[PDB]
């Protein structure tokens with residue numbers, strides 16, 4: 172059934188599973204027209220498809236040309252997401268195909284179920300977790316890969332860098348969701364935390380900085396403070 | 409005008425004949441139902457006084473044979489049987505009529521209700537949904553499950569309605585996922601009407617039979633089938649104009665005949681609100697929308 176705090180360790184067992192987040196697929200800027208009406212302009216988007224055990228992130232970039240001449244784009248966006256996830260699964264060797272796909276928004280359930288009818292043994296699940304994957308476009312290198320695209324494209328990234336050499340996939344996921352939650356609540360401060368110290372760099376083949384174990388504990392603490400800080404600034408506490 | 413005699417009435421029972429019903433007391437001198445209109449299927453149904461559990465009954469067409477009812481004290485129910493000896497049967501009926509031991513099918517001359525509820529229902533199609541080929545009549549009761557219910561357990565006692573499933577490869581053309589899921593016209597017109605039912609009359613017949621089993625027996629799987637067949641039409645953008653107009657008439661008479669006190673269990677809020685207010689056909693069911701809004705405005 173639905174994925175929640177009670178069955179949270181299931182994410183890190185040995186059954187292949189993917190999270191699918193569609194919140195960055197259809198992105199627009201809203202603006203005024205010369206006549207003073209309002210119009211939207213689409214910008215490039217992306218499907219965020221993540222194996223939480225391995226960190227492998229199948230980022231399917233959605234180029235604005237896919238919307239051309241189409242109506243009801245927010246509805247289309249869900250079906251386009253389901254089409255691309257289904258195509259991804261079909262492209263994988265059988266032993267790499269997931270046994271479950273967890274969608275972060277319940278509105279993806281029917282589009283994905285219909286696109287995956289050919290795969291009756293792959294469970295399509297919702298989740299009660301409020302996961303911060305919309306903030307994926309606050310990861311500089313990821314945002315850059317999406318905005319520069321001139322055509323559809325999907326790139327395989329590892330969202331954990333080399334962390335699994337030193338920590339478990341439970342801890343890596345926890346660190347990821349904390350970083351993304353922070354970037355979602357206050358992107359400027361979060362990014363200030365992550366880069367403030369010019370001696371810690373991001374490798375050319377890495378997304379996040381090369382923190383020692385001790386520095387990650389400092390960083391992680393500073394993100395919790397930020398999230399708590401903002402929760403106060405927000406609610407006045 | 410045809411007759412279904414009863415050997416006797418040894419247990420107290422409420423007897424239904426189509427949309428009519430009457431109470432018979434234990435060992436009361438009741439010997440059947442006369443003046444049954446020829447030209448329609450009919451259903452004769454039963455609810456025992458001591459155990460309202462299991463409504464049960466028999467679909468039949470008096471043009472297909474001479475049928476009577478006889479209580480079986482071993483299986484504990486009123487059973488329909490065919491009498492092959494035509495002269496024995498005529499003589500039984502004439503005797504019971506002379507002794508005035510029969511109730512008269514109580515049809516008001518003005519009243520087209522039963523026709524309107526069974527317009528497309530044929531006995532031959534009933535017998536394919538309810539498989540028991542040695543009898544000309546068909547038994548249905550409250551508990552019988554449908555083929556589709558059994559997929560999700562005794563196959564010989566099942567209602568073999570046409571399986572409809574909106575999230576199924578049958579309903580969804582590869583590469584037309586979104587189109588076919590949001591507009592079911594392909595599934596209605598190509599898969600179901602052209603492919604399986606052959607014409608809209610057979611589709612309506614199954615829809616009407618499904619409603620009548622839901623109403624008369626409280627058969628839950630029949631109610632599921634009735635609503636699915638409605639939803640498939642309402643969720644299609646492209647439906648022949650004559651089908652929509654006929655559907656509006658069919659549903660009107662069904663909603664009109666429904667017991668007011670059973671509306672809570674016989675009508676699916678989601679399907680009806682979707683069909684009348686959100687679907688492609690939200691503006692095509694004028695008679696049905698008007699009676700629903702005046703009779704069951706709570707559901708909506």
Ligand SMILES: O=C1NCCN1C1CC1
Nearest residue numbers: 312328329375376377378
């Ligand atoms: O890990 C990173 N950072 C962004 C580029 N690179 C992947 C594409 C090879």
